[PDB]
Amino acid sequence: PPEFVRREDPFHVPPALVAVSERGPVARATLADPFWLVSGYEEARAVLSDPRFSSDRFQYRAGSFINMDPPEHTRYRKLLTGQFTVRRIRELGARIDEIVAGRVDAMLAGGTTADLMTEFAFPAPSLMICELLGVRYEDRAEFQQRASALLQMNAPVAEAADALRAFMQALVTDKRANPAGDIISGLIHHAGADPALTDDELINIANLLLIAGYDTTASMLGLGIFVLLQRPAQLATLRDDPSRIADAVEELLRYLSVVNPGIFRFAKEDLEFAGEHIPAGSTVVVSVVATNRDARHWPDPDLDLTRPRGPHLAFGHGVHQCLGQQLARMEMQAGYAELLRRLPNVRLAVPPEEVPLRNDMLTYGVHSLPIAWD
């Protein structure tokens, strides 16, 4: 229902979500059939930690643990979390530091303008996923090609883009043959899997890591700059007080809420949660944007990079919180800092209302971002 998915601009919650949120923190709406929308922050964490609710749309390839419930979800997640070791995070963070520098090095070498999405926001997230999956330098062109084949937009799998699946097929075979330090190697060689992951499981996880971390991280990075460019006092705070970068990124996650139209749950059971009667199989969707703006939790919900960090729902809650949230944070922290610091007097190169937003996409963001500097 488009009125729930559409965002006119990023500084307001959609009027229809605001209408529903007025009825209740959890409130029925009509699809097509009634589903519920959660706009309350405590209510959201409550549905997300609640086990009467499923991530399986159909029940009430494989290895795709984001639509799985524990026990089965928990087996893969724990394999995935275990390979997210300190040694990985440290190396990936240094890679990430290198990545954001090369893209800015390339923007500055190019002239005084760029489209931010082309030259920084899609490329930085993309290259980090390369490092994560152990994609070699000579294969990144091929890799960057096959995965900007999302138009417009979102898809599992690729129905049966095998081209991407085919690339991942070769990579895994490669990894079994020659084990490096990447996430695919560890799962195969060092995650202690019993039973051992199959090629299909391994392919399906690799795509999910790209899919899950790529649009979201790129939409965050582009939209965050776009918002800073319209809110010059905020931009200065981040650019001028560089030690406050950890708090700023946490604010953009909460204010921008790129996950649109929200996190999805289904009721395994007939249930009553917060006074509502919910038949089995009914969609429950947590609106990330509305909830991160709950006035009961945040008296002032407007954007403040001055604000000290607290929890928000941009990365989900409970058993499925982004596996990638620490990598996304390092890239968002590294990437916003490098642009504001290295691009003098950065500004939009076209008027703000001319900028193209993604309202025909699941993940909220910007299509193009023309910018200038000096």
Q: Is 320 annotated as a binding residue?
A: yes
Q: What angle do CA 105, 129, 224 make, to 5 degrees?
A: 60
Instruction: Give the CA diameter of the chain.
Output: 60
- Assess 157 for contact with ligand HEM (CB under 6 A): no
- Assess 77 for contact with ligand HEM (CB under 6 A): yes
Which range of residues in 44-52, 115-123, 148-156, 300-308 is near ligand 9LF by CB under 6 A? 148-156
Residues 6+ apart with CB under 8 A from 200: 61, 62, 63
Among 16, 66, 108, 348, binds ligand 9LF (CB under 6 A): 66
Residues 154/163, Cβ–Cβ less than 8 Å: no
Which range of residues in 9-17, 222-230, 231-239, 257-265 is near ligand HEM by CB under 6 A? 257-265
- Assess 362 for contact with ligand 9LF (CB under 6 A): yes
Q: Is 88 annotated as a binding residue?
A: no
371's tokens: 């910018």
Among 15, 19, 33, 57, binds ligand 9LF (CB under 6 A): 57
d(CA 232, CA 223): 14
- Assess 85 for contact with ligand 9LF (CB under 6 A): no
Question: Which one-letter DSSP state was computed for residue 133?
Answer: T
- Assess 372 for contact with ligand 9LF (CB under 6 A): no
- Assess 264 for contact with ligand 9LF (CB under 6 A): yes
d(CA 188, CA 4): 42
Sheet holding 263-267: strands in order across? 26-30, 34-38, 283-286, 263-267, 53-54
Nearer to ligand HEM, 171 or 323 (CB): 323
Q: Binding partner of residue 357 among ligand HEM, ligand 9LF, none, CB under 5 to 8 Å per kind?
A: none
Dihedral-angle region of residue 274 (phi above 0 means left; psi in -120 to 50 means alpha; beta otherwise) = left
Q: Binding partner of residue 343 among ligand 9LF, ligand HEM, none, CB under 5 to 8 Å per kind?
A: none
Which range of residues in 152-160, 174-182, 248-256, 303-311 is near ligand 9LF by CB under 6 A? 152-160
Residues 6+ apart with CB under 8 A from 113: 349, 370, 371, 372, 373
Among 35, 36, 65, 120, binds ligand HEM (CB under 6 A): 65
Which range of residues in 186-194, 300-308, 318-326, 333-341 is near ligand HEM by CB under 6 A? 318-326
Q: What is the DSSP string of 2-68?
A: HHHH--S-TTS--HHHHHHHHH-SEEEEE---EEEEE--HHHHHHHHH-TTEES-TTT-----GGG-
Residue 247: phi and psi, rounded to 5, are -75, -35
Among 197, 259, 267, 284, binds ligand HEM (CB under 6 A): 259
Residues 6+ apart with CB under 8 A from 193: 79, 187
Which residues belong to the annotated binding site for heme b? Answer: 77, 265, 320, 322
Under the rule (CB under 6 A), what is the footprint of ligand 9LF?
55, 57, 66-67, 154-156, 211, 259, 263-264, 362
Which residues belong to the annotated binding site? Answer: 77, 265, 320, 322
Under the rule (CB under 6 A), what is the footprint of ligand HEM?
55, 65-66, 77, 208-209, 212-213, 216-217, 220, 258-259, 263, 314-316, 320, 322-324, 327-328
